[PDB]
Design an enzyme around this catalytic site. Structure first.
Site, PDB file in Angstrom:
ATOM      1  N   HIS A  61     -19.918 -61.816  95.288  1.00  0.00           N
ATOM      2  CA  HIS A  61     -18.530 -62.259  95.316  1.00  0.00           C
ATOM      3  C   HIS A  61     -18.120 -62.667  96.714  1.00  0.00           C
ATOM      4  CE1 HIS A  61     -18.456 -59.316  91.829  1.00  0.00           C
ATOM      5  NE2 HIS A  61     -18.280 -60.510  91.294  1.00  0.00           N
ATOM      6  N   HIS A  91     -14.294 -57.261 103.750  1.00  0.00           N
ATOM      7  CA  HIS A  91     -14.738 -58.393 102.945  1.00  0.00           C
ATOM      8  C   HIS A  91     -14.288 -59.684 103.620  1.00  0.00           C
ATOM      9  CE1 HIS A  91     -15.237 -55.397  99.617  1.00  0.00           C
ATOM     10  NE2 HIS A  91     -14.197 -54.834 100.198  1.00  0.00           N
ATOM     11  N   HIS A  93     -13.482 -63.706 102.928  1.00  0.00           N
ATOM     12  CA  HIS A  93     -13.266 -64.793 101.987  1.00  0.00           C
ATOM     13  C   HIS A  93     -13.434 -66.054 102.830  1.00  0.00           C
ATOM     14  CE1 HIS A  93     -11.961 -62.018  98.846  1.00  0.00           C
ATOM     15  NE2 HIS A  93     -11.517 -61.280  99.845  1.00  0.00           N
ATOM     16  N   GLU A 103      -6.959 -66.412 101.876  1.00  0.00           N
ATOM     17  CA  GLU A 103      -6.281 -66.057 100.646  1.00  0.00           C
ATOM     18  C   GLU A 103      -4.785 -66.150 100.916  1.00  0.00           C
ATOM     19  OE1 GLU A 103      -8.399 -62.362  99.087  1.00  0.00           O
ATOM     20  OE2 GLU A 103      -8.948 -64.063  97.805  1.00  0.00           O
ATOM     21  N   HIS A 116     -10.782 -59.071 105.603  1.00  0.00           N
ATOM     22  CA  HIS A 116     -10.047 -57.884 105.186  1.00  0.00           C
ATOM     23  C   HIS A 116     -10.740 -56.591 105.610  1.00  0.00           C
ATOM     24  CE1 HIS A 116      -8.322 -60.453 101.652  1.00  0.00           C
ATOM     25  NE2 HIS A 116      -7.691 -60.683 102.788  1.00  0.00           N
ATOM     26  N   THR A 195      -7.379 -58.575  95.833  1.00  0.00           N
ATOM     27  CA  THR A 195      -7.385 -59.997  95.508  1.00  0.00           C
ATOM     28  C   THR A 195      -8.517 -60.390  94.571  1.00  0.00           C
ATOM     29  OG1 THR A 195      -8.569 -60.479  97.578  1.00  0.00           O
ATOM     30  CG2 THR A 195      -6.161 -60.741  97.588  1.00  0.00           C
ATOM     31  N   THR A 196      -9.248 -59.391  94.094  1.00  0.00           N
ATOM     32  CA  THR A 196     -10.332 -59.635  93.157  1.00  0.00           C
ATOM     33  C   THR A 196     -10.223 -58.559  92.096  1.00  0.00           C
ATOM     34  OG1 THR A 196     -11.963 -58.124  94.141  1.00  0.00           O
ATOM     35  CG2 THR A 196     -11.871 -60.367  95.027  1.00  0.00           C
TER      36      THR A 196
END
Length: 257
Positions: A61, A91, A93, A103, A116, A195-196
């Protein structure tokens, strides 16, 4: 399984996770015009002197880091936070173009990426119990913009090949979160969620106003990661970000005037 493609992306999440349409979903666009300075916000406290990173991984992911959260070595307090929040993971993105990737957005502007740092309220015993609570997590979001190379990211960038496919992981004891923090700690805060999937609304968001810089070459290496597993057809890990969700009248507070 959920993803970011046409057939499993954010537009589909609600089916398996009905909360995707909740009242406290993340991310949101930070509208500086409606955001309001909150004088009751105490100074933000980031205690990252003690190292705790254990390894870097590819979970199919996003690129991520797991930190040793057995003790109060790396915590987040102050600001809108009540209590102590322990660092457990990070994480990243990333976009497929420099014009997109973050995000959260500020006045509709997107950044090349968003990092994050996930912390859990130590009053709940552990991460698992914390995520079931409205105030169980505190997540620090940091925008990445293309420019000068970021020293604190080169060590990771050199070993990304070792975690190219999902299910892969490498030991990594020197991912210092202090080295990815901007100069200023000014931020916006608002109650939100992961957010996931599971998209649990258990997060107190602390988005830093000032983005950090990273070189073109560093971004390019993270864009070479794979969503897929070994031997499977290649799907570059790019554009693994959720678009801005309805604010639903939530209040975004600023830490600065």
């Amino acid at each position: 399984h959920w993803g970011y493609g046409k057939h499993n992306g954010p537009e589909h999440w609600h089916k398996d996770f009905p909360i995707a349409k909740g009242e406290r979903q993340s991310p949101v666009d930070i509208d500086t015009h409606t955001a309001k300075y909150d004088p009751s916000l105490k100074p933000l406290s980031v205690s990252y002197d003690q190292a705790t990173s254990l390894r870097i991984l590819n979970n199919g992911h996003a690129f991520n880091v797991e930190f040793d959260d057995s003790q109060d070595k790396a915590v987040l307090k102050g600001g809108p936070l009540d209590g102590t929040y322990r660092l457990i993971q990070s994480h990243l993105h990333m976009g497929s173009l420099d014009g997109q990737g973050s995000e959260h957005t500020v006045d509709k502007k997107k950044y090349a990426a968003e990092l994050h740092l996930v912390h859990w309220n130590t009053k709940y015993g552990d991460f698992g119990k914390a995520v079931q609570q409205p105030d169980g997590l505190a997540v620090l979001g940091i925008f990445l913009k293309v420019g000068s190379a970021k020293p604190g990211l080169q060590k990771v960038v050199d070993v990304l090949d070792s975690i190219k496919t999902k299910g892969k992981s490498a030991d990594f004891t020197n991912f210092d979160p202090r080295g990815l923090l901007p100069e200023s700690l000014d931020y916006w805060t608002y109650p939100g969620s992961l957010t996931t999937p599971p998209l649990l609304e258990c997060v107190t968001w602390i988005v830093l106003k000032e983005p950090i810089s990273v070189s073109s070459e560093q971004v390019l290496k993270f864009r070479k990661l794979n969503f897929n597993g070994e031997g499977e057809p290649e799907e570059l890990m790019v554009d693994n970000w959720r678009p801005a969700q309805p604010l639903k009248n939530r209040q975004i507070k600023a830490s600065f005037k």
